[PDB]
Write a protein that binds this ligand. Structure first.
Ligand code: MG
Ligand code: MG
Ligand code: MG
Ligand code: MG
Ligand code: MG
Ligand code: MG
Ligand code: MG
Ligand code: MG
Ligand code: MG
Ligand code: ZN
Lengths: 85, 86, 73, 162, 142, 59
RNA sequence: UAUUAAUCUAGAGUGUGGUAGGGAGUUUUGGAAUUUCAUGUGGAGCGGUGAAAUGCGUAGAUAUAUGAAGGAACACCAGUGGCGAAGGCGAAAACUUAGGCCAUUACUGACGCUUAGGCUUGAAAGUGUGGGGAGCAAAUAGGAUUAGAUACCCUAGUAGUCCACACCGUAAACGAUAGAUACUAGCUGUCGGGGCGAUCCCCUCGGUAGUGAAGUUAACACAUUAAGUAUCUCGCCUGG
């Protein structure tokens, strides 16, 4: 079994438990990964971090290094494969 | 010299709004041929017009064959008026 | 490398002239012409293909009516 | 049809070249409507064709049958006072149907005046700027498109058996 | 009242038209398809749904009663693999296939179905054997 | 191709005339041997393609 | 299924309304550039090559400036382009003319696909008659190179390349992929018609490209413009 966070551009056959989500945002990714870790943590019998929890304790911050977004650009870096004769 | 499509349709119409039958189509086709035979006879080196002329000639023959297969009596009426046989 | 703006715009399309006459925008066509009495290409002139052809025919027609030069020398 | 001649005559003197245009008008043009003429006049010439650089420019906006061209064309060369003449038949020019189309004119007018307001723009250039060299995206999509978007003609179908 | 958006056109051969539609839908995993409706196509599709390869088939008519198009769907299982495996047409235009009752074919040792329209419209091969009467053989479906 | 020297400096003059002459030179080698229409069309499309691909990665 | 007697519009056409084109023929016109000739200035080489030599030049060449004559082809535009069934089409104009795309509450009402035989067109070279001939150049002469050079190089150089009318009917005439019909992911371009109304960009209907999965192939590769899933018709293949 393999689970994955598909982002609209993945072949569904390869993954087993697809979990529609983002993958480019340092906030969505962290939230979902901890949730799966939280299931494991509850099964292992140590307190959870984000799952089955209220509003006041889930708030997280956006990492630094325009603005946190998720647009895919940088298309100019895809010219024609070097050819001609 | 040029033709007028409006006049030929009004003359060859069997009844009003019948602007797409076989009789009106073949009458228009014959008129353009007369003009087109003139043009090709004058020039003698334009072959696209010759291709168009041959294609147009073939369409009337096929159209007249169909109108012979169905309702042959109306074929007689149209042929004597238009004088296309000979 | 180099940098600049991709402003490359077809003038006549925004102004919607839709029609080119050689004695209505003569000073406009002289801009499209290069200083060497030569019709500038896409990279410089900036019009679309349709208006470039239209301006090109008009520029050559003016050059037949003997309104604009044909080459420096 | 409606033709448009752009005549060229020598730079002798204005009234006699204007007079020269009148004979060329009354002799030929077998069948013709009203021949309104303007007087671009003695403008400089791009080359000394016919050993002439100072020419009077005339434009004729007549209209008539296709026979109006032959006699005038064959007489122009013979006449030593005429340098060039071009009968630019506007029914074959690059774009003739749109100028007669009424709604097209309107949208054309439409397009020009707004782009021009952009041109006017409160303290617009900020530098030479060229006619544009400064054009923002058409904001969010032209909502008018989304509202007046045309629904095609398909068909409503009714169930019969199941 | 079912609405559509696309114009519906179809190929001329009504048995292989359906066969091409069915095979392409199977290969492309498509579910909803449309085609023009003919009584032969309706009847052959009716026995098809009785023999159990497709689920539903609804024919509709225009508001003028001049055109009819049949829109059928396939029976996919939960894991999204179809029940149809392969379709092949025998009596193509030009070469019409006529076999007597004694030479009625058996498809995949009886697992598949052979479609035969003898005299009382289209009829499956097994019931055709029961009636001891044969005729036109349209296509093999398994 | 007249361009004035302006008599303020010389270098600037040779910097512009070098460009004009190279575009002039290009056509000069083009017009020395007559090639067939197929071969001639091939070299035009090739030059455009070379310039195009260059402009693609330079833009 | 075939025959016959009829109805319908969705196939295909016609008309109206939008509309893009280097589509074709005929008749006129124009400028750069070369050659020759005319007139000046000028004074020893020019030309050609790997290096040179035939060759041109004190009879004043090359060069420079002006003019005249003539023929051929139409820089730029010109394209990650347009048109035509193909060959092909790019200086300008006039006249005649072919097809195509989009929307159709209009009309006829299966009138459609393919096509043996037949007809038409069909690059260049080649032929016959009459013109034309600036440049270029098969054949040919000379100078080089070479062991030899009937070749590659150079200097000359006829037919021909051009036009009109008659033939020839072949090409790697290639997308090495016949036409028509139905279905099958998507993405990035670009062109045309239409809708909105700043361009730009969005949507629809088409044409032309790139990338790309199922699918196909021996592989390369094709992949909605198929070499995929299927039907009709024609042409063709059966070891060297
Ligand atoms: Mg001179
Ligand atoms: Mg020849
Ligand atoms: Mg010898
Ligand atoms: Mg020589
Ligand atoms: Mg000979
Ligand atoms: Mg052959
Ligand atoms: Mg070819
Ligand atoms: Mg590919
Ligand atoms: Mg043998
Ligand atoms: Zn434009």
């Amino acid at each position: 079994p393999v689970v994955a966070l598909c982002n609209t551009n993945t072949n569904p056959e390869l993954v087993d438990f697809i979990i529609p989500a983002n993958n480019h945002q340092p906030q969505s990714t962290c939230l979902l990964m901890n949730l799966l870790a939280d299931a494991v943590a509850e099964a292992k019998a140590m307190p959870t971090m984000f799952a089955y929890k209220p509003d006041e304790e889930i708030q997280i911050e956006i990492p630094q290094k325009k603005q946190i977004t998720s647009q895919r650009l940088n298309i100019t870096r895809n010219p024609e494969v070097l050819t001609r004769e | 010299m040029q033709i007028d499509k409006n006049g030929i349709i009004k003359s060859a119409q069997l009844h009003d709004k019948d602007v797409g039958s076989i009789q009106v189509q073949v009458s228009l086709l014959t008129s353009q041929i007369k003009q087109l035979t003139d043009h090709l006879l004058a020039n003698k080196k334009d072959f696209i017009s010759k291709r168009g002329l041959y294609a147009k000639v073939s369409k009337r023959k096929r159209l007249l064959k169909y109108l012979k297969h169905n309702d042959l009596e109306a074929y007689r009426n149209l042929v004597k008026t238009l004088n296309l046989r000979g | 490398p180099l940098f600049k703006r991709s402003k490359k715009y077809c003038r006549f399309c925004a102004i919607g002239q839709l029609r080119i006459d050689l004695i209505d925008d003569l000073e406009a066509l002289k801009r499209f012409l290069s200083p060497y009495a030569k019709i500038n290409p896409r990279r410089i002139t900036g019009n679309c293909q349709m208006h470039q052809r239209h301006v090109a025919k008009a520029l050559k027609r003016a050059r037949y009516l003997a309104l604009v030069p044909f080459v420096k020398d | 049809m409606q033709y448009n001649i752009i005549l060229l005559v020598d730079g002798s003197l204005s009234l006699e070249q204007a007079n020269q245009v009148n004979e060329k008008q009354q002799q030929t043009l077998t069948n013709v409507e009203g021949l309104q003429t303007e007087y671009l006049g003695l403008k400089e010439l791009a080359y000394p064709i016919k050993k002439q650089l100072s020419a009077h420019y005339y434009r004729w906006k007549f209209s008539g049958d296709n026979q109006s061209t032959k006699d005038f064309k064959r007489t122009a060369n013979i006449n030593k006072q005429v340098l060039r003449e071009l009968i630019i038949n506007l029914e074959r020019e690059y774009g003739y149907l749109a100028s007669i189309n009424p709604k097209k004119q309107q949208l054309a007018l439409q397009k020009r005046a707004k782009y021009d307001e952009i041109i006017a723009r409160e303290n617009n250039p900020e530098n030479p700027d060229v006619p544009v060299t400064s054009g923002l995206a058409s904001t969010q999509p032209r909502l008018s498109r989304t509202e007046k978007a045309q629904k095609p003609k398909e068909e409503l179908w009714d169930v019969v058996q199941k | 009242m079912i609405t559509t958006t696309k114009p519906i056109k179809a190929h001329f051969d009504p048995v292989a038209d359906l066969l091409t539609k069915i095979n392409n839908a199977r290969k492309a995993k498509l579910m909803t398809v449309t085609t023009i409706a003919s009584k032969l196509k309706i009847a052959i599709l009716e026995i098809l749904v009785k023999e159990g390869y497709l689920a539903n088939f609804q024919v509709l008519e225009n508001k003028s009663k001049t055109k009819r198009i049949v829109t059928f769907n396939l029976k996919y299982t939960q894991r999204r693999i179809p029940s149809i495996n392969g379709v092949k047409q025998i009596s193509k235009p030009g070469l019409r296939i006529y076999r007597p009752f004694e030479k009625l074919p058996l498809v995949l040792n009886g697992l598949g179905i052979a479609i035969i329209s003898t005299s009382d419209g289209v009829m499956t091969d097994k019931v055709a054997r029961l009636k001891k009467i044969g005729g036109e053989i349209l296509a093999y479906v398994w | 191709p007249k361009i004035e020297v302006k008599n303020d400096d010389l270098e600037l003059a040779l910097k512009k005339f070098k460009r004009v002459s190279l575009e002039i030179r290009r056509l000069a080698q083009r017009h020395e041997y007559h090639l067939r229409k197929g071969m001639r069309l091939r070299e035009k499309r090739k030059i455009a393609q070379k310039k195009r691909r260059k402009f693609r990665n330079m833009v």
